[PDB]
Amino acid sequence: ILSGETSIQLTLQFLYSHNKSDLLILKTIKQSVEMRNSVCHSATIYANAIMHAGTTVDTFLRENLDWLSRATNWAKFSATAGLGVIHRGHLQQGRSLMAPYLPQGGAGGGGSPYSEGGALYALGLIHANHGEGIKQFLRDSLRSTNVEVIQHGACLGLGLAALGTADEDVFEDIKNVLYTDSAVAGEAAGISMGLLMVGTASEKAGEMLAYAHETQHEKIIRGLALGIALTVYGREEEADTLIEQMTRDQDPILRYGGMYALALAYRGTSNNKAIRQLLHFAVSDVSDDVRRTAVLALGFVLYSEPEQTPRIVSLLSESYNPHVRYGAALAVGISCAGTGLSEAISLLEPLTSDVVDFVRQGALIAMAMVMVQITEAMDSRVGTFRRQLEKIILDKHEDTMSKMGAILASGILDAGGRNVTIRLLSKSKHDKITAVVGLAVFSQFWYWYPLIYFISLAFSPTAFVGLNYDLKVPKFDFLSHAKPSLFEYPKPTTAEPCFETITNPARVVPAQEKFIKFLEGSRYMPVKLAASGFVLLKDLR
Amino acid sequence: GLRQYYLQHIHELQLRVRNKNHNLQRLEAQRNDLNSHVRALKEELQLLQEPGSYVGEVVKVMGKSKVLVKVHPEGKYVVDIDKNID
């Protein structure tokens, strides 16, 4: 249990058994996407990977191999990396499933280096946080290969497999790759050192900052600037010295990292000092990248109190600067993820019709993050939004960035077979490090598209799984005192009873938790009154 | 002593909160009028980018929104009507 292997296996069984992903949506998107547009082709691969996250269903890729074989360079890297999101949590066969795409140590493996690098990144996504068996294999793969694309996938895979383990030996191996000054491997190395050292406040953050001043490669500076921001996770006042150094820097890319460092230092605290500094930089800086990030960073400071975020961001959404309006859309998307707040939806609606294509892209993604798992019976606006997404995807005259946003939004709405939600806070009100970090890396998809797969880390399964003394799942029934239509799955392509008696092992949305009651006289009684998650049952018979 | 010691700050915080809200709203509206003016002005930048509009004088109208008017130097022609014209 403490290793997480049992909780992952039970989650994977739940996601496999309850997979209600609509393959017709993906078939429609595939037919509307022009075959020459590499961005829309990559967007459909990302949407497929998000829709089937942890369900092990690869049927769409198997049926469409002739369409996948048209992927070139980084689209082929992403195609292979997308298998890691689909097979997420499959710890035992994770190596055997990837074996055809892994670098075979003989001069006769006809793989493309993009597929081999993407397979190493896929292994890290499958074994995220649970790297004990694969850490050595990824280290040996990193040391054996001088190809930048394979090193890029190995670094990111190793950073995901070793997330928050503070392993010094993995740090020195990734640091040796950073000192090769390769523009693509160094961006991954920068992020991976940050992922390894999350929230340690190590003096090593000073070594990363020193190297960020020496390198001429903007990709390495950006990867290090985010990597430094990840080391500072959790640290509040201990971070202020390093944040003041990064924010007074001459380089706009280091100031951009300084805004993430402030966001990740003051995550979920709602601190007035941090909010005032972020709002100051959102207006005073000359760089639109710093301005966008300063507004986006408000979403990470304010997610503890999602009701305050629309009020603060409303004034920024009306700004003349499109980068600030984009940051405003994503700030609300991150803070209000899975809450369904009506104020947040009313603020995002105008931004979906913006003149600027990337503002529309941000608004569509943010709306999908807020509306994740919401039914048309709870809010009629979900039905209008799904028709709007379909319209944008079918239209030929729409901009490529707005289409990419609509495809990703459709993927996020139907994520994990409709059984996952984006959740920054645990039920215990602890910060989910993987979800905050996953969303902070995900927000950088403008510079590097393969970072889109980090959204998978922010997916929390919405399951009730009752377990016996032997850690097996018994069949038993429990009552929901709500109308079934509120917590139903959307219908496929073509007062009331309030005692929906579904099996205790079933999808339970956070809004449904208040209506769940155990039947007095059932064979199984919970040791603790918990309405969702893993609950141990006392057998009375 | 709890009634006269702890709960007393609830009746105090709200008084300042109410005035801060109004002052912030007034300042925000003052800034918002200006921001909207600036956004408009930048919109007129592209407004003057689009091609102009010709002048027309319909000599004869036709049912179902058909128009044949006098072009200044050219003449007349058969066209349709707009979306919000009686």
Binding site: S270, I275, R276, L279, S284 | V17, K20, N21, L27
Partner: peptide, 30 residues
């Protein structure tokens, strides 16, 4: 709970307080 109404009221008031600097920043950037 009885002390919660005061603690929450203080939290919201403090949050609205930063709105002064927030507005002041735009009043000059605008």
């Amino acid at each position: 709970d009885l002390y919660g109404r005061l603690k929450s009221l203080e939290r919201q008031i403090e949050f609205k307080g930063i709105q002064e600097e927030y507005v002041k920043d735009e009043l000059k950037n605008l």
